[PDB]
């Protein structure tokens, strides 16, 4: 069902894994739970057309209360992209680089 309208917060710096997949821990600051977490990679912050691919299968925030946790993993493209969590003006982004 519906996406998460509130703001996220990285609770730890994203980290590269096995062959270049990045994992992300966030904390959600909204009371519209339950809701699907807006997670994706992107290269154009205007279009937010998904680059890469979200590896986490259907990430939904569980609780209906403020401050819940969540862990996501994505498959970023080669070179430079942006991790993009949340929607709107409260979007959070972190630059990513993947070599080979």
């Amino acid at each position, epitope marked *: 069902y*519906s996406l998460c309208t509130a703001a996220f917060t990285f609770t730890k710096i994203p980290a590269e894994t096995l062959h270049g997949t990045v994992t992300v821990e966030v904390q959600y600051a909204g*009371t519209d739970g339950p809701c699907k977490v807006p997670a994706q990679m992107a290269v154009d912050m*205007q279009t937010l057309t998904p680059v890469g691919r979200l590896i986490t299968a259907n990430p939904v925030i569980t609780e209906s209360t403020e401050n819940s946790k969540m862990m996501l993993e994505l498959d970023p493209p080669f070179g430079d992209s942006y991790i993009v969590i949340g929607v*709107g003006e409260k*979007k959070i982004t972190h630059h990513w680089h993947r070599s080979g």
Partner: antibody
Amino acid sequence: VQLLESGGGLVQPGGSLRLSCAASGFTFKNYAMAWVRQAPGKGLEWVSLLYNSEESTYYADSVKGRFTISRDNSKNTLFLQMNRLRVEDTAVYFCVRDRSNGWSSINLWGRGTLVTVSS
Amino acid sequence: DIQMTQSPSTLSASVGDRVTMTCRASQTISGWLAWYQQKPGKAPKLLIYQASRLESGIPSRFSGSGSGTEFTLTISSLQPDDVATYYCQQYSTFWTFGLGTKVEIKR
């Protein structure tokens, strides 16, 4: 940069009206759009919002099932299909662009189109 | 949902005076708050976003400040063009609008 609403007027209770808004001055496809109404002498009430997908469309409980919004990115046009109208739906309806991708400050407003659900 | 209360409901003051209105939210809305001016019959004009960021083109006399649960909009030197109602908007979770603060002018 402009929003222009049209389609409003007088509807019989239980009737149906289809509002539309014409966007200009920006990549309409990129921004979230919403309809915010204002009953006469009352406050602002957001009624519906949409960005891309089924998951990124929202409806205030007061119009759930009754209203529907639609996005025609080829024509840069927003629709609000309201059915089963009730007398208290009488209000001015503002077509509104979100700052970004949804649920932000509202930095582009229409002119208002007044829907009068009367009998 | 997050209820929003504004005060004062109405107020009259004089050209030059420092007007100050307040609004409180039923729970933490961080800094995700915006202020709108709406003269009758026209549409709202956003003035402030993120509690305290002045929108582009809005006059400098308008300011904002606040965090978490209580916020304040402050017109430093009232001007005849400011006769309007003033609404606040939270946007931490969905949207909620205040009921307004009507500013009348004393001459």
